[PDB]
């Protein structure tokens, strides 16, 4: 047995390695803390084939997409163990009724300022530009933060009223997507104004900013608790405080809760359980990681009660209280691409903020209408009857793509019925992981091949043959998770092709 733990390079990995070394001394078992590049991207590729780490570490927002793929194993955390962590932290790691990952710590962006340069932090975002005038006079910069990640810019975009998905009575509504509304256009406009008014360069990354503030070159930065240790080490006189206001209202950061999930493919499930509950999630386990790089408002009540007495944590918690817990819906991986692209094209000057935000909002519309078209076809091909409920935006286009899918998709199923049958029988998809396995196989078979409407219809028709065969054994709960993945490989990995082919209109045009 062994334990391979993947965790982001910005988190305390040497501290976690000390926790695994402490576990190593009591079990023999080697714990290996690797911190790979583009972790949120690499984990899904490897763990789909069943080649990942035993324990994965990321903010909860990506775990809901991992669970739909079946890249995660369900955790069995005893009734007594759950009472040791905060109820809201367990809620962040709950997907479709099931706890999929372990809550570690609540993370939220706070404003970090140098007390020597600024005796006080500015109450508003609108007073940061004129501060730069008086700070440049002394050879300095007023504010520098990561402009590459939309996580760092979201609190300004969300302050006046921008949002990912609205929380309609215990659920997210993918029809109500506010990345285009006036509050987002106003927030992002102020950021673009700072680059137009030379107050900020539209190329500052995590390292540029961490160097600048910690060297004493910039007056304030934006960051999470993980960055505290490097400021502490730089000996800079700093204060962590509430984020400034935009247009009178607070900056609402997206609030992530660092989670610890176990690969479903992994053969060290019970080993990861003892490691996570009995070793890591204890005051001494979290104090070891926290000593390397601060976690934030930790899930563990025992250690959080102590940690609460730190005004840096109180600022973090007040900022978390003024922001929102990020959704864990599968669309989130795709949502972030759309939004990173928008923040990067607005700052880079490649686009107007109305355009950059539109192509981003449009990206969610392609995801919604696509999940609607695909799932409708697939569900009606198992029941044998149409759904009569409305579809919203681009309704007549989605209506025609369905009557186009029924004609062309049933032609593919008919003309290739002999072949589809052999493929479905040569797989023995009996249980849910076997079905989710297929989801990934067709996802990568289509992708590692040419992108055209022919192959799209083929991939969807096979999905409808599968939806018919799922129904046969009553475990037809995988139809929508299958329909949402075919949407993902399409609007996520082939976004540009679909947009170049005039969306679903080009498909209805294609076959006539
Ligand atoms: O910026 C988009 C990005 O935001 C979040 O990632 C944060 C993460 O939560 C922090 O712990 C830290 O690692 O910084 C990241 C931003 O660089 C989402 O979790 C992530 O999925 C998303 O792509």
mmCIF file of C-alpha atoms in Angstrom, residues 179-511:
data_model
loop_
_atom_site.group_PDB
_atom_site.id
_atom_site.type_symbol
_atom_site.label_atom_id
_atom_site.label_comp_id
_atom_site.label_asym_id
_atom_site.label_seq_id
_atom_site.Cartn_x
_atom_site.Cartn_y
_atom_site.Cartn_z
ATOM 1 C CA UNK A 179 -22.292 37.314 -16.039
ATOM 2 C CA UNK A 180 -23.802 39.803 -18.564
ATOM 3 C CA UNK A 181 -25.960 41.975 -16.275
ATOM 4 C CA UNK A 182 -25.104 45.661 -15.559
ATOM 5 C CA UNK A 183 -23.454 44.884 -12.199
ATOM 6 C CA UNK A 184 -20.800 42.762 -13.968
ATOM 7 C CA UNK A 185 -20.278 45.254 -16.813
ATOM 8 C CA UNK A 186 -19.737 47.961 -14.137
ATOM 9 C CA UNK A 187 -17.397 45.878 -11.990
ATOM 10 C CA UNK A 188 -15.222 44.642 -14.852
ATOM 11 C CA UNK A 189 -15.225 48.195 -16.386
ATOM 12 C CA UNK A 190 -13.547 49.572 -13.265
ATOM 13 C CA UNK A 191 -10.817 46.916 -13.565
ATOM 14 C CA UNK A 192 -10.284 47.745 -17.259
ATOM 15 C CA UNK A 193 -10.249 51.470 -16.247
ATOM 16 C CA UNK A 194 -7.335 50.774 -13.875
ATOM 17 C CA UNK A 195 -5.326 49.321 -16.783
ATOM 18 C CA UNK A 196 -6.383 52.113 -19.213
ATOM 19 C CA UNK A 197 -5.413 54.698 -16.527
ATOM 20 C CA UNK A 198 -1.987 52.858 -16.084
ATOM 21 C CA UNK A 199 -2.764 52.124 -12.347
ATOM 22 C CA UNK A 200 -2.335 48.344 -13.135
ATOM 23 C CA UNK A 201 -0.606 46.283 -15.957
ATOM 24 C CA UNK A 202 -2.902 43.699 -17.601
ATOM 25 C CA UNK A 203 -0.282 40.882 -17.226
ATOM 26 C CA UNK A 204 0.365 40.729 -13.444
ATOM 27 C CA UNK A 205 0.310 37.123 -12.301
ATOM 28 C CA UNK A 206 0.397 35.439 -8.837
ATOM 29 C CA UNK A 207 4.194 35.575 -8.663
ATOM 30 C CA UNK A 208 4.559 39.149 -10.022
ATOM 31 C CA UNK A 209 2.114 40.407 -7.407
ATOM 32 C CA UNK A 210 3.537 38.263 -4.520
ATOM 33 C CA UNK A 211 7.004 39.591 -5.327
ATOM 34 C CA UNK A 212 5.753 43.272 -5.675
ATOM 35 C CA UNK A 213 3.835 43.462 -2.354
ATOM 36 C CA UNK A 214 6.355 41.383 -0.350
ATOM 37 C CA UNK A 215 9.271 43.490 -1.771
ATOM 38 C CA UNK A 216 7.477 46.706 -0.690
ATOM 39 C CA UNK A 217 6.838 47.972 -4.240
ATOM 40 C CA UNK A 218 2.969 47.834 -4.168
ATOM 41 C CA UNK A 219 0.778 49.317 -1.345
ATOM 42 C CA UNK A 220 -1.899 46.550 -1.340
ATOM 43 C CA UNK A 221 -2.611 43.061 -2.839
ATOM 44 C CA UNK A 222 -5.643 40.701 -2.840
ATOM 45 C CA UNK A 223 -5.108 37.033 -1.736
ATOM 46 C CA UNK A 224 -6.097 34.085 0.481
ATOM 47 C CA UNK A 225 -4.643 32.764 3.731
ATOM 48 C CA UNK A 226 -2.148 30.610 1.814
ATOM 49 C CA UNK A 227 -0.167 33.805 0.985
ATOM 50 C CA UNK A 228 0.342 34.934 4.636
ATOM 51 C CA UNK A 229 3.505 32.867 5.280
ATOM 52 C CA UNK A 230 5.437 34.577 2.427
ATOM 53 C CA UNK A 231 4.459 38.041 3.757
ATOM 54 C CA UNK A 232 5.483 36.885 7.321
ATOM 55 C CA UNK A 233 8.825 35.706 5.864
ATOM 56 C CA UNK A 234 9.327 39.025 3.954
ATOM 57 C CA UNK A 235 8.978 40.871 7.362
ATOM 58 C CA UNK A 236 6.605 43.409 5.758
ATOM 59 C CA UNK A 237 4.359 45.386 8.224
ATOM 60 C CA UNK A 238 0.966 44.171 6.916
ATOM 61 C CA UNK A 239 -2.728 44.035 7.739
ATOM 62 C CA UNK A 240 -5.382 41.678 6.332
ATOM 63 C CA UNK A 241 -8.765 43.438 6.122
ATOM 64 C CA UNK A 242 -12.239 43.571 4.501
ATOM 65 C CA UNK A 243 -12.376 44.105 0.692
ATOM 66 C CA UNK A 244 -13.199 47.724 -0.492
ATOM 67 C CA UNK A 245 -16.675 48.745 -1.692
ATOM 68 C CA UNK A 246 -17.679 49.172 -5.320
ATOM 69 C CA UNK A 247 -20.522 51.663 -5.820
ATOM 70 C CA UNK A 248 -21.438 51.610 -2.125
ATOM 71 C CA UNK A 249 -21.879 47.839 -1.903
ATOM 72 C CA UNK A 250 -19.278 45.274 -0.687
ATOM 73 C CA UNK A 251 -16.939 43.262 -2.932
ATOM 74 C CA UNK A 252 -18.428 39.778 -2.952
ATOM 75 C CA UNK A 253 -15.662 37.172 -3.415
ATOM 76 C CA UNK A 254 -16.316 33.636 -4.527
ATOM 77 C CA UNK A 255 -15.798 31.452 -1.401
ATOM 78 C CA UNK A 256 -14.075 28.105 -1.877
ATOM 79 C CA UNK A 257 -13.777 25.315 0.705
ATOM 80 C CA UNK A 258 -10.546 23.255 0.163
ATOM 81 C CA UNK A 259 -11.718 19.689 -0.213
ATOM 82 C CA UNK A 260 -10.110 16.277 -0.051
ATOM 83 C CA UNK A 261 -11.592 13.619 -2.336
ATOM 84 C CA UNK A 262 -10.478 10.003 -2.954
ATOM 85 C CA UNK A 263 -10.074 8.559 -6.485
ATOM 86 C CA UNK A 264 -12.673 5.865 -7.238
ATOM 87 C CA UNK A 265 -9.945 4.016 -9.224
ATOM 88 C CA UNK A 266 -7.591 3.993 -6.197
ATOM 89 C CA UNK A 267 -6.990 0.716 -4.353
ATOM 90 C CA UNK A 268 -6.119 2.471 -1.033
ATOM 91 C CA UNK A 269 -9.636 3.665 -0.050
ATOM 92 C CA UNK A 270 -9.641 2.562 3.647
ATOM 93 C CA UNK A 271 -6.004 3.778 3.953
ATOM 94 C CA UNK A 272 -7.012 7.259 2.735
ATOM 95 C CA UNK A 273 -9.977 7.195 5.216
ATOM 96 C CA UNK A 274 -7.724 6.562 8.293
ATOM 97 C CA UNK A 275 -5.220 9.126 6.955
ATOM 98 C CA UNK A 276 -7.869 11.830 6.395
ATOM 99 C CA UNK A 277 -10.031 11.457 9.495
ATOM 100 C CA UNK A 278 -7.508 10.153 12.058
ATOM 101 C CA UNK A 279 -4.367 12.011 10.872
ATOM 102 C CA UNK A 280 -5.047 15.137 8.788
ATOM 103 C CA UNK A 281 -8.337 16.417 10.219
ATOM 104 C CA UNK A 282 -7.001 16.973 13.784
ATOM 105 C CA UNK A 283 -5.561 20.103 15.508
ATOM 106 C CA UNK A 284 -2.016 18.756 15.060
ATOM 107 C CA UNK A 285 -2.577 17.767 11.426
ATOM 108 C CA UNK A 286 -3.999 21.163 10.489
ATOM 109 C CA UNK A 287 -1.428 23.044 12.605
ATOM 110 C CA UNK A 288 1.303 21.233 10.558
ATOM 111 C CA UNK A 289 -0.149 22.352 7.180
ATOM 112 C CA UNK A 290 -1.083 25.797 8.535
ATOM 113 C CA UNK A 291 2.538 26.242 9.772
ATOM 114 C CA UNK A 292 3.791 25.816 6.188
ATOM 115 C CA UNK A 293 0.970 27.932 4.565
ATOM 116 C CA UNK A 294 -2.240 29.153 6.265
ATOM 117 C CA UNK A 295 -5.457 27.239 5.382
ATOM 118 C CA UNK A 296 -8.066 29.759 6.542
ATOM 119 C CA UNK A 297 -11.308 29.170 8.452
ATOM 120 C CA UNK A 298 -10.763 25.347 8.860
ATOM 121 C CA UNK A 299 -13.673 22.835 8.920
ATOM 122 C CA UNK A 300 -12.408 21.390 12.223
ATOM 123 C CA UNK A 301 -14.206 23.053 15.129
ATOM 124 C CA UNK A 302 -11.436 22.184 17.634
ATOM 125 C CA UNK A 303 -8.716 24.069 15.735
ATOM 126 C CA UNK A 304 -11.009 26.779 14.237
ATOM 127 C CA UNK A 305 -12.091 27.959 17.723
ATOM 128 C CA UNK A 306 -8.448 28.825 18.417
ATOM 129 C CA UNK A 307 -7.734 30.147 14.855
ATOM 130 C CA UNK A 308 -10.824 32.466 15.153
ATOM 131 C CA UNK A 309 -8.865 34.687 17.644
ATOM 132 C CA UNK A 310 -6.615 35.849 14.730
ATOM 133 C CA UNK A 311 -7.872 39.192 13.226
ATOM 134 C CA UNK A 312 -6.523 37.975 9.828
ATOM 135 C CA UNK A 313 -9.028 35.026 10.088
ATOM 136 C CA UNK A 314 -11.817 37.402 11.225
ATOM 137 C CA UNK A 315 -11.196 39.523 8.077
ATOM 138 C CA UNK A 316 -11.203 36.340 5.933
ATOM 139 C CA UNK A 317 -14.440 35.166 7.573
ATOM 140 C CA UNK A 318 -16.118 38.583 7.177
ATOM 141 C CA UNK A 319 -15.135 38.505 3.460
ATOM 142 C CA UNK A 320 -16.485 34.936 3.131
ATOM 143 C CA UNK A 321 -19.690 36.126 4.923
ATOM 144 C CA UNK A 322 -19.999 38.958 2.271
ATOM 145 C CA UNK A 323 -19.334 36.698 -0.741
ATOM 146 C CA UNK A 324 -20.879 33.409 -1.874
ATOM 147 C CA UNK A 325 -20.041 29.694 -1.734
ATOM 148 C CA UNK A 326 -19.215 28.767 -5.284
ATOM 149 C CA UNK A 327 -21.503 26.230 -6.978
ATOM 150 C CA UNK A 328 -20.222 22.678 -7.390
ATOM 151 C CA UNK A 329 -22.402 22.022 -10.507
ATOM 152 C CA UNK A 330 -20.714 20.187 -13.387
ATOM 153 C CA UNK A 331 -20.893 23.281 -15.665
ATOM 154 C CA UNK A 332 -18.348 25.030 -13.297
ATOM 155 C CA UNK A 333 -15.262 23.712 -15.162
ATOM 156 C CA UNK A 334 -16.689 25.281 -18.384
ATOM 157 C CA UNK A 335 -17.910 28.431 -16.501
ATOM 158 C CA UNK A 336 -14.390 29.211 -15.404
ATOM 159 C CA UNK A 337 -12.972 28.913 -18.946
ATOM 160 C CA UNK A 338 -15.582 31.356 -20.267
ATOM 161 C CA UNK A 339 -14.860 33.815 -17.373
ATOM 162 C CA UNK A 340 -11.000 33.530 -17.482
ATOM 163 C CA UNK A 341 -11.263 34.236 -21.240
ATOM 164 C CA UNK A 342 -13.507 37.296 -20.497
ATOM 165 C CA UNK A 343 -11.250 38.794 -17.754
ATOM 166 C CA UNK A 344 -8.176 38.184 -19.958
ATOM 167 C CA UNK A 345 -9.726 39.681 -23.159
ATOM 168 C CA UNK A 346 -11.098 42.741 -21.338
ATOM 169 C CA UNK A 347 -7.763 43.602 -19.703
ATOM 170 C CA UNK A 348 -5.748 42.635 -22.835
ATOM 171 C CA UNK A 349 -7.774 45.134 -24.905
ATOM 172 C CA UNK A 350 -8.738 42.318 -27.347
ATOM 173 C CA UNK A 351 -12.412 43.066 -26.556
ATOM 174 C CA UNK A 352 -14.907 45.621 -25.237
ATOM 175 C CA UNK A 353 -16.299 44.571 -21.815
ATOM 176 C CA UNK A 354 -19.821 44.285 -23.353
ATOM 177 C CA UNK A 355 -18.456 41.850 -25.985
ATOM 178 C CA UNK A 356 -16.127 39.834 -23.651
ATOM 179 C CA UNK A 357 -18.965 39.373 -21.176
ATOM 180 C CA UNK A 358 -21.417 38.501 -23.961
ATOM 181 C CA UNK A 359 -19.255 35.661 -25.414
ATOM 182 C CA UNK A 360 -18.991 34.435 -21.799
ATOM 183 C CA UNK A 361 -22.784 34.586 -21.131
ATOM 184 C CA UNK A 362 -23.284 33.049 -24.627
ATOM 185 C CA UNK A 363 -20.968 30.200 -23.494
ATOM 186 C CA UNK A 364 -23.420 29.369 -20.709
ATOM 187 C CA UNK A 365 -26.307 29.589 -23.245
ATOM 188 C CA UNK A 366 -24.636 27.063 -25.503
ATOM 189 C CA UNK A 367 -24.211 24.791 -22.378
ATOM 190 C CA UNK A 368 -27.895 25.233 -21.312
ATOM 191 C CA UNK A 369 -29.583 24.839 -24.741
ATOM 192 C CA UNK A 370 -27.222 21.912 -25.472
ATOM 193 C CA UNK A 371 -28.001 20.025 -22.238
ATOM 194 C CA UNK A 372 -31.707 20.743 -22.961
ATOM 195 C CA UNK A 373 -31.516 19.374 -26.610
ATOM 196 C CA UNK A 374 -29.369 16.320 -25.827
ATOM 197 C CA UNK A 375 -31.116 15.262 -22.596
ATOM 198 C CA UNK A 376 -34.566 15.735 -24.150
ATOM 199 C CA UNK A 377 -33.768 13.449 -27.105
ATOM 200 C CA UNK A 378 -32.107 10.841 -24.784
ATOM 201 C CA UNK A 379 -34.972 10.855 -22.211
ATOM 202 C CA UNK A 380 -37.675 10.668 -24.900
ATOM 203 C CA UNK A 381 -35.770 7.730 -26.506
ATOM 204 C CA UNK A 382 -36.089 5.684 -23.266
ATOM 205 C CA UNK A 383 -39.679 6.541 -22.261
ATOM 206 C CA UNK A 384 -40.890 6.783 -25.883
ATOM 207 C CA UNK A 385 -42.559 10.138 -25.291
ATOM 208 C CA UNK A 386 -41.730 13.814 -25.620
ATOM 209 C CA UNK A 387 -41.381 16.300 -22.723
ATOM 210 C CA UNK A 388 -43.900 19.128 -23.066
ATOM 211 C CA UNK A 389 -42.307 21.702 -20.673
ATOM 212 C CA UNK A 390 -40.908 24.979 -22.072
ATOM 213 C CA UNK A 391 -37.214 25.662 -22.947
ATOM 214 C CA UNK A 392 -36.664 29.422 -22.734
ATOM 215 C CA UNK A 393 -34.085 31.339 -24.860
ATOM 216 C CA UNK A 394 -33.617 30.150 -28.461
ATOM 217 C CA UNK A 395 -36.696 27.895 -28.109
ATOM 218 C CA UNK A 396 -37.586 27.553 -31.811
ATOM 219 C CA UNK A 397 -33.904 26.685 -32.646
ATOM 220 C CA UNK A 398 -33.883 23.984 -29.921
ATOM 221 C CA UNK A 399 -37.307 22.720 -31.172
ATOM 222 C CA UNK A 400 -35.934 22.303 -34.722
ATOM 223 C CA UNK A 401 -32.675 20.640 -33.487
ATOM 224 C CA UNK A 402 -34.833 18.033 -31.719
ATOM 225 C CA UNK A 403 -36.944 17.332 -34.830
ATOM 226 C CA UNK A 404 -33.572 17.154 -36.697
ATOM 227 C CA UNK A 405 -32.067 14.773 -34.086
ATOM 228 C CA UNK A 406 -35.142 12.504 -34.215
ATOM 229 C CA UNK A 407 -34.772 12.199 -37.991
ATOM 230 C CA UNK A 408 -30.947 11.946 -38.357
ATOM 231 C CA UNK A 409 -30.191 10.270 -34.986
ATOM 232 C CA UNK A 410 -32.694 7.472 -35.621
ATOM 233 C CA UNK A 411 -31.157 6.976 -39.111
ATOM 234 C CA UNK A 412 -27.735 6.448 -37.524
ATOM 235 C CA UNK A 413 -29.227 4.062 -34.907
ATOM 236 C CA UNK A 414 -30.975 2.092 -37.663
ATOM 237 C CA UNK A 415 -28.132 1.937 -40.268
ATOM 238 C CA UNK A 416 -25.601 1.014 -37.555
ATOM 239 C CA UNK A 417 -27.903 -1.141 -35.297
ATOM 240 C CA UNK A 418 -25.860 -4.301 -35.779
ATOM 241 C CA UNK A 419 -22.643 -2.507 -34.743
ATOM 242 C CA UNK A 420 -24.167 -0.570 -31.790
ATOM 243 C CA UNK A 421 -25.620 -3.839 -30.349
ATOM 244 C CA UNK A 422 -22.221 -5.607 -30.395
ATOM 245 C CA UNK A 423 -20.570 -2.608 -28.764
ATOM 246 C CA UNK A 424 -23.210 -2.450 -25.965
ATOM 247 C CA UNK A 425 -23.033 -6.251 -25.343
ATOM 248 C CA UNK A 426 -19.173 -6.325 -25.445
ATOM 249 C CA UNK A 427 -19.079 -3.872 -22.477
ATOM 250 C CA UNK A 428 -21.255 -5.483 -19.726
ATOM 251 C CA UNK A 429 -22.354 -2.053 -18.374
ATOM 252 C CA UNK A 430 -24.255 -3.546 -15.415
ATOM 253 C CA UNK A 431 -23.675 -0.988 -12.585
ATOM 254 C CA UNK A 432 -23.359 2.879 -12.353
ATOM 255 C CA UNK A 433 -19.495 3.009 -12.545
ATOM 256 C CA UNK A 434 -19.696 0.809 -15.672
ATOM 257 C CA UNK A 435 -22.127 3.347 -17.242
ATOM 258 C CA UNK A 436 -20.076 6.403 -16.148
ATOM 259 C CA UNK A 437 -17.018 4.534 -17.574
ATOM 260 C CA UNK A 438 -18.726 4.484 -21.032
ATOM 261 C CA UNK A 439 -19.491 8.261 -20.607
ATOM 262 C CA UNK A 440 -15.702 8.910 -20.503
ATOM 263 C CA UNK A 441 -14.826 6.417 -23.273
ATOM 264 C CA UNK A 442 -17.185 8.029 -25.836
ATOM 265 C CA UNK A 443 -16.132 11.467 -24.594
ATOM 266 C CA UNK A 444 -12.507 10.734 -25.479
ATOM 267 C CA UNK A 445 -13.301 8.656 -28.643
ATOM 268 C CA UNK A 446 -15.198 11.591 -30.180
ATOM 269 C CA UNK A 447 -12.580 14.126 -29.010
ATOM 270 C CA UNK A 448 -9.538 12.170 -30.261
ATOM 271 C CA UNK A 449 -11.231 12.379 -33.723
ATOM 272 C CA UNK A 450 -12.441 15.038 -36.222
ATOM 273 C CA UNK A 451 -15.081 17.567 -35.260
ATOM 274 C CA UNK A 452 -18.066 17.660 -37.665
ATOM 275 C CA UNK A 453 -21.910 17.300 -37.445
ATOM 276 C CA UNK A 454 -21.701 13.690 -38.650
ATOM 277 C CA UNK A 455 -19.591 12.522 -35.698
ATOM 278 C CA UNK A 456 -21.632 14.744 -33.293
ATOM 279 C CA UNK A 457 -24.857 12.926 -34.304
ATOM 280 C CA UNK A 458 -23.033 9.604 -34.026
ATOM 281 C CA UNK A 459 -21.896 10.337 -30.454
ATOM 282 C CA UNK A 460 -25.484 11.450 -29.518
ATOM 283 C CA UNK A 461 -27.204 8.514 -31.293
ATOM 284 C CA UNK A 462 -24.981 6.031 -29.418
ATOM 285 C CA UNK A 463 -25.961 7.876 -26.228
ATOM 286 C CA UNK A 464 -29.650 7.354 -27.185
ATOM 287 C CA UNK A 465 -29.002 3.614 -27.857
ATOM 288 C CA UNK A 466 -27.444 3.550 -24.337
ATOM 289 C CA UNK A 467 -30.397 5.523 -22.865
ATOM 290 C CA UNK A 468 -32.711 2.780 -24.345
ATOM 291 C CA UNK A 469 -30.478 -0.006 -22.845
ATOM 292 C CA UNK A 470 -30.269 1.761 -19.387
ATOM 293 C CA UNK A 471 -34.106 1.854 -19.245
ATOM 294 C CA UNK A 472 -34.084 -1.980 -19.855
ATOM 295 C CA UNK A 473 -32.430 -2.512 -16.477
ATOM 296 C CA UNK A 474 -34.390 0.367 -14.693
ATOM 297 C CA UNK A 475 -31.055 2.189 -13.719
ATOM 298 C CA UNK A 476 -31.946 5.090 -15.963
ATOM 299 C CA UNK A 477 -30.601 7.698 -13.485
ATOM 300 C CA UNK A 478 -27.396 7.974 -15.674
ATOM 301 C CA UNK A 479 -29.293 9.451 -18.684
ATOM 302 C CA UNK A 480 -28.958 13.115 -17.578
ATOM 303 C CA UNK A 481 -25.375 12.681 -16.175
ATOM 304 C CA UNK A 482 -24.531 11.150 -19.650
ATOM 305 C CA UNK A 483 -26.364 14.011 -21.478
ATOM 306 C CA UNK A 484 -24.462 16.638 -19.367
ATOM 307 C CA UNK A 485 -21.054 15.055 -20.250
ATOM 308 C CA UNK A 486 -21.699 14.918 -24.052
ATOM 309 C CA UNK A 487 -22.639 18.628 -23.610
ATOM 310 C CA UNK A 488 -19.319 19.240 -21.784
ATOM 311 C CA UNK A 489 -16.940 17.593 -24.354
ATOM 312 C CA UNK A 490 -18.876 19.626 -26.982
ATOM 313 C CA UNK A 491 -19.404 23.194 -25.582
ATOM 314 C CA UNK A 492 -16.282 22.971 -23.372
ATOM 315 C CA UNK A 493 -13.552 21.322 -25.496
ATOM 316 C CA UNK A 494 -15.024 22.312 -28.916
ATOM 317 C CA UNK A 495 -16.534 25.736 -28.006
ATOM 318 C CA UNK A 496 -14.854 27.466 -30.962
ATOM 319 C CA UNK A 497 -16.039 24.942 -33.622
ATOM 320 C CA UNK A 498 -19.664 25.157 -32.365
ATOM 321 C CA UNK A 499 -19.542 28.968 -32.395
ATOM 322 C CA UNK A 500 -17.943 28.990 -35.897
ATOM 323 C CA UNK A 501 -20.780 26.696 -37.117
ATOM 324 C CA UNK A 502 -23.461 29.165 -35.881
ATOM 325 C CA UNK A 503 -24.330 26.974 -32.876
ATOM 326 C CA UNK A 504 -27.295 24.613 -32.987
ATOM 327 C CA UNK A 505 -28.611 26.596 -36.061
ATOM 328 C CA UNK A 506 -25.735 25.236 -38.199
ATOM 329 C CA UNK A 507 -26.768 21.660 -37.263
ATOM 330 C CA UNK A 508 -30.422 22.180 -38.247
ATOM 331 C CA UNK A 509 -29.071 23.868 -41.425
ATOM 332 C CA UNK A 510 -26.668 20.937 -42.109
ATOM 333 C CA UNK A 511 -29.469 18.372 -42.479
#
